[PDB]
């Protein structure tokens, strides 16, 4: 495995997202800003990717999470569709945990998988492109939250999404 230092890619970010100056934190603003046009920019779903993706090996990072509904995070295949409304599902190229309806989910499809995992504050995401897995652990005790098994066929990026104005995600040092 290998610890990675990530920064958010502001050209992928939906123009409603508010990114911290240091490119670690993301929240949802009210209304879009007039940001420059790029094919990589999510124009409808409230998503942003890190600037660095991974094509081989094992990598991990940590994400600090808000306590209110609206976030989801994990990884996305590079080919995830950027223009138009997409489903937030594995078949559309996102593998993520989510806080929605007051509880945590692994976003499996067609039915999400509810978790019983206490309160999440910081989460370790561990991407293994050797065996084909993405796993999530609560940092404070390394308790296993969920593993998706996927034999990835392309470059995979850290993924963050915030669809409600009262919460946040932050890449954590």
């Amino acid at each position: 495995e290998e610890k990675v230092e990530l920064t958010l890619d502001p050209d992928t970010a939906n123009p409603r997202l508010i990114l911290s100056l240091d490119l670690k934190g993301v929240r949802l603003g009210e209304r879009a800003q007039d940001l420059p046009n790029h094919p990589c920019r999510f124009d409808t779903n409230t998503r942003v990717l890190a600037s660095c993706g991974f094509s081989s090996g094992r990598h991990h990072w940590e994400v600090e999470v808000g306590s209110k509904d609206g976030w989801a995070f994990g990884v996305a295949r590079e080919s995830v569709r950027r223009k138009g409304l997409t489903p937030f599902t594995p078949e559309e190229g996102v593998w993520a945990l989510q806080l929605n309806g007051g509880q945590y989910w692994a976003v499996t499809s067609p039915e999400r998988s509810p978790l019983s995992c206490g309160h999440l504050s910081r989460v370790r995401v561990a991407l293994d492109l050797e065996v084909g897995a993405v796993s999530f652990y609560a940092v404070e005790d390394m308790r296993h939250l969920y593993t998706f098994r996927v034999n990835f066929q392309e470059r995979v990026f850290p993924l963050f999404s915030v669809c409600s104005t009262g919460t946040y995600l932050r890449i954590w040092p």
């Binding site: 409808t44 779903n45 609206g70 409304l85 937030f88 929605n100 669809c163 409600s164």
Partner: peptide, 10 residues
């Protein structure tokens, strides 16, 4: 069935 409202844009 389906998502909550704002969650459709996740």
């Amino acid at each position: 069935v389906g998502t909550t409202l704002e969650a459709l844009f996740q």
